[PDB]
């Protein structure tokens, strides 16, 4: 097992199935060896991926839960549901310590800042809102999108937050001054998912795309935007140019992310497959028939060689990597 090169394999490890509704998203706990998944039955079930044993359900949401996230310490879980509410969970006690209102429609994303003192969320009211962890007050609103904003994700340092909306555009914002750094629009259809480039991949991205080394030394933040036109595009936030376009998915791309080692791209779509991409050569090695229905999301563990993929068939699967 190469410590930065493992990829998932067709033989699944565990097939966890307790949800009564399609699984929306699946995430890994940064510290503990435990798994958290959110579904459309207003439940957030927590699983252990080493033994595949269900532990507990985090209920309290009225309607379907759309996104969940963890802070850096793993002590807080931020969940957003379609009931216009954002709930903050004390993970040690497994209770809802704060409920956040203010969105005028369905909330489809949520994330905790790397500093851990602020929460960013995006909803169907065409706004991206920011909240305080301590007080639960809305402090900033990022307007400018013309349609439903589906996902919002911050960069490594938390200074920039990216958002993808139904307006077929991907916008990068500056948290400090709320300005739109760039408007990345090349997808011909609605963009579903976004993902940033980890620090271990800037050199690989620069040498793979043929981009010359910059005098500053920083190649610039790189963004991925999977959309429903069955294409995956990698962008240069600094320059606003689409570095490459990945083709090969048979349906709408629902999730995309980098390998922890920054060597491959993992992406799941509605074609019932999970695909591993080589951005070095702009081609796909392995296609995994993950589920019997649409694949809603995927996540890649930072250290352990495990991949989790949610699906509409109400099944959460854990993949060994070899």
């Amino acid at each position: 097992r190469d410590p930065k090169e493992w990829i998932p394999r067709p033989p699944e490890k565990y097939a966890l199935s307790g949800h009564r509704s399609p699984v929306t998203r699946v995430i890994f706990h940064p510290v503990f060896s435990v798994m958290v998944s959110a579904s459309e039955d207003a439940t957030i079930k927590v699983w252990d991926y080493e033994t595949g044993d269900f532990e507990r359900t985090l209920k309290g949401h009225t309607d379907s839960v759309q996104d969940i996230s963890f802070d850096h310490s793993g002590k807080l879980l931020a969940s957003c549901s379609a009931d216009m509410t954002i709930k903050l969970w004390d993970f040690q006690g497994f209770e809802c310590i704060r409920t956040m209102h203010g969105h005028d429609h369905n909330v489809s994303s949520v994330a905790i800042m790397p500093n851990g003192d602020h929460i960013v969320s995006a909803s169907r009211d065409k706004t991206i809102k920011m909240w305080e962890v301590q007080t639960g007050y809305c402090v900033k609103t990022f307007t400018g999108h013309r349609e439903w904003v589906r996902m919002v994700r911050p960069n490594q340092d938390g200074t920039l937050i990216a958002s993808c909306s139904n307006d077929q555009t991907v916008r990068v914002w500056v948290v400090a001054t709320k300005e739109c750094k760039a408007e990345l629009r090349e997808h011909e259809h609605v963009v579903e998912c976004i993902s940033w480039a980890p620090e271990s991949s800037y050199s690989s991205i620069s040498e793979a795309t043929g981009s010359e080394t910059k005098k500053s030394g920083k190649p610039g933040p790189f963004l991925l935007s999977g959309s429903r036109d069955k294409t995956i595009k990698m962008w240069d936030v600094s320059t606003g140019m689409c570095l490459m376009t990945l083709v090969g998915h048979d349906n709408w791309v629902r999730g995309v992310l980098f390998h922890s080692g920054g060597k491959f791209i993992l992406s799941c779509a509605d074609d019932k497959t999970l695909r591993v991409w080589d951005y070095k050569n702009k081609r796909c090695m392995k296609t995994l028939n993950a589920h019997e229905h649409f694949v809603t999301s995927l996540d890649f563990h930072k250290t352990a060689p495990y991949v989790v993929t949610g699906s509409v068939d109400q099944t959460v699967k854990v993949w060994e990597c070899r």
Binding site: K230, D250, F294, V312
Partner: protein, 435 residues
């Protein structure tokens, strides 16, 4: 005069001028007295001229004179020498721009160029899809000093439709001789292409206002500005018309007073031989994507031509108004197959037939009204395919639920009904909570 310009050292001599004019005059008479008639009538006029004239004529026993142009040297030369068997590039197969040369095409393009060079108004008459718009646009490519503007006439068309175009593409300027209308640009002649001139309805007294308006602009070189009752003179403006035959439903015959200024050229439907040549070239270029399928170009073209012929005669405007079939359908037929073959790196012969059959249904069956016609199309598609493509898997290519979609794959591939139903049901669930 152009010949003398090209030959400054050797001006054209009288005996060459005498020969050239005499051949041209006979060539001019045939195209001026029978250009608005069928091919049979054109041949009949040529026979009558041959029986009475003394000008030297082509010696071909059966080729009509209309197939011979007049060379600048002063000798008859067949039109067949200017229609070479070209090879279209694969990426421009059945494109709107590309025109396959044909005997009728070159004759009309030269005739269209002659009238257009004089800025003389002209009207192309023929059934829809026969090539009236194409031939004119092809001729305008030989005249870089002209800009074409497309106007579509309807039953409610009235002269202000021409007026609003004038403000957009021309400007009114004050001159000492009066108000003169000219295009905003300089040096190019504006050509107003009126696609359906004969639909504008007559009043109860049998007069079309726009036709009289066009007649006024061409005979008197201008019109009247109704805002200030000021005469306006047209400059660098040309009129070109297109229309279906007046006997077609909804069409009205044009006024005789309008017809004197406007020669009419008849563009009939291409014959089976012409259609085979035109779409055989398209098929050969299109089928170069799959080298293993290049041997099927001829049977594919014959099948496309044959089924188009049977469909055209079976369904006519008598039953339903929209039962109009033209080469446009076959152009869409080639486009449909070419798009379905671009992403595929290989395909068996049965797969090509399935795509060929799929496009036939989407073009000739979607507009049929009752089930009897649809069943007729289904049966005859199989018979045509079997007749031109023997010894192939019938069931593999003629599976009745012929469904093609790019929903379940990155490319346009056949999709089974059951998987398609499941996917649409899953999509509908998302469609409910989104839209």
């Amino acid at each position: 005069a152009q010949y003398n310009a090209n030959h400054p050292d050797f001006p054209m001599q009288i005996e060459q001028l005498e020969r050239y004019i005499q051949r041209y005059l006979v060539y001019a008479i045939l195209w001026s007295l029978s250009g608005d008639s069928r091919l049979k009538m054109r041949a009949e006029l040529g026979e009558y001229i041959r029986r009475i004239t003394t000008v030297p004529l082509p010696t071909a026993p059966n080729i009509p004179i209309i197939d011979y142009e007049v060379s600048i040297s002063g000798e008859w030369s067949p039109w067949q020498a200017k229609v070479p068997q070209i090879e279209v590039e694969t990426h421009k197969v059945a494109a709107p721009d590309v025109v396959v040369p044909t005997l009728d095409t070159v004759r009309h393009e030269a005739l269209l160029y002659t009238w257009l060079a004089e800025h003389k108004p002209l009207v192309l008459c023929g059934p829809p899809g026969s090539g009236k718009t194409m031939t004119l646009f092809s001729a305008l490519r030989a005249l870089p000093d002209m800009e074409v503007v497309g106007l579509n006439f309807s039953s409610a068309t009235t002269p202000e439709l021409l007026l609003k175009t004038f403000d957009h593409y021309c400007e009114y300027r004050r001159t000492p001789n009066g108000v003169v209308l000219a295009p905003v640009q300089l040096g190019k002649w504006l050509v107003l292409f009126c696609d359906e001139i004969n639909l504008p309805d007559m009043d109860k007294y049998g007069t079309q206002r726009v036709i009289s308006f066009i007649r006024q602009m061409v005979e008197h070189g201008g019109f009247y500005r109704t805002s200030d009752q000021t005469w306006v003179k047209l400059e660098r403006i040309q009129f070109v018309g297109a229309c279906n035959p007046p006997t077609d439903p909804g069409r009205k015959p044009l006024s005789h007073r309008f017809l004197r200024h406007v020669p009419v050229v008849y563009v009939d439907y291409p014959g089976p031989a012409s259609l085979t040549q035109i779409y055989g070239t398209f098929n050969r270029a299109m089928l170069r994507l799959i080298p293993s399928l290049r041997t099927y170009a001829e049977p594919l073209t014959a099948a496309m031509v044959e089924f188009y012929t049977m469909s055209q005669e079976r369904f006519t405007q008598d039953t339903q108004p929209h039962y109009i079939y033209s080469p446009r359908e076959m152009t869409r037929w080639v486009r449909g197959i070419f798009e379905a073959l671009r992403p595929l790196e290989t395909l068996p012969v049965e797969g090509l037939i399935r795509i060929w059959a799929h496009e036939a249904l989407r073009l000739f069956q979607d507009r049929l009204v009752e089930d009897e016609e649809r069943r007729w199309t289904d049966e005859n598609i199989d018979t045509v395919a079997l007749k031109h493509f023997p010894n192939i898997d019938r069931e593999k290519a003629m599976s009745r639920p012929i469904l093609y979609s790019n929903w379940l794959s990155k490319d346009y591939i056949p999709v089974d009904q059951e998987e398609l139903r499941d996917y649409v049901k899953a999509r509908l669930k998302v469609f409910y909570e989104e839209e």
